[PDB]
Ligand binder design. Structure first.
Ligand SMILES: NC[C@@H]1CN(c2ncnc3[nH]c4cnccc4c23)CCO1
Length: 253
């Protein structure tokens, strides 16, 4: 019942996250502090999956969210700049990311800001999707609603979000998962944003894969990236088809 605030884990816009330890059980949890979030709590209440940060509850005093503590830090910190990480680790992380994203989409939730900073690791390096502050419902009563608000993080957002007034939620999270995979395999982000004024993005659309970061990436995972980082959201590979991808299914290590 009584928790000691041991240390700060991370900072956010509207607050900070602190590690809290139970005085009796010594259980660790993370506490997200927000000095007024209503939708974040609501969405968190729906979530129950092994690749999504668990929600234990909240107390209003300033709002306090009680969330799963992930001692392994963030995926961001397993990526060596300009190098990435070993391909078998990247594949395992990507499998776990798809599992989390499939779950969310299955309950009609889109995260909207998938990036390595938001993908946390537990003590066994299991990936956990965190931070549902930008998340929203895109399906309800089996009826899809198109999105129109721009949010997320420029290097990770899909090009339709910049160009179209309305867009489907799922292909946007698929795209950001592809940017995450690129980062894991090349240790660099391919562009500032996916717009026609961005030279690196133009190069990609013209298939200059002899340039970085694409030249650091083996042809198998690169063929999967060619299917994810497709400009037309309607032509973009879906998750069920990602699960059928050759590299996705390649035994590694
Ligand atoms: N960018 C990550 C860092 C450290 N971080 C975390 N660190 C450890 N465990 C956590 N569990 C969480 C549940 N929800 C949100 C965040 C965490 C969290 C907080 C954010 O800044």
């Amino acid at each position: 019942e009584d928790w000691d605030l041991v240390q700060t884990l991370g900072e956010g816009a509207y607050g900070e996250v602190q590690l809290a330890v139970n005085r009796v059980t010594e259980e660790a949890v993370a506490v997200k502090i927000v000095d007024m979030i209503k939708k974040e709590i609501c969405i968190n209440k729906m979530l129950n999956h092994e690749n999504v940060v668990k929600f234990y509850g909240h107390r209003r005093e300033i709002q306090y969210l009680f969330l799963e503590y992930c001692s392994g830090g963030e995926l961001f910190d397993r990526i060596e700049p300009d190098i990435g990480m070993p391909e078998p680790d990247a594949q395992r992380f990507f499998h776990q990311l798809m599992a989390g994203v499939v779950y969310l989409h299955g309950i009609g939730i889109t995260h909207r800001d998938i990036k390595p900073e938001n993908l946390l690791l537990d003590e066994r390096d299991n990936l956990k999707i965190s931070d549902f502050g930008l998340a929203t419902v895109f399906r309800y009563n089996n009826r899809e609603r198109l999105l129109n608000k721009m949010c997320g993080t420029l290097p990770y957002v899909a090009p339709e979000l910049l160009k179209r007034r309305e867009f489907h939620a799922e292909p946007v999270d698929v795209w950001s998962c592809g940017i995450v995979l690129t980062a894991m395999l090349a240790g660099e982000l391919p562009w500032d944003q996916p717009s026609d004024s961005c030279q690196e993005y133009s190069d990609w659309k013209e298939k200059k894969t002899y340039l970085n970061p694409w030249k650091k990436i083996d042809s198998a995972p690169l063929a999967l990236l060619h299917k994810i980082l497709v400009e037309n959201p309607s032509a973009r590979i879906t998750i069920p088809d990602i699960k059928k991808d050759r590299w996705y299914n390649k035994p590694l290590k």
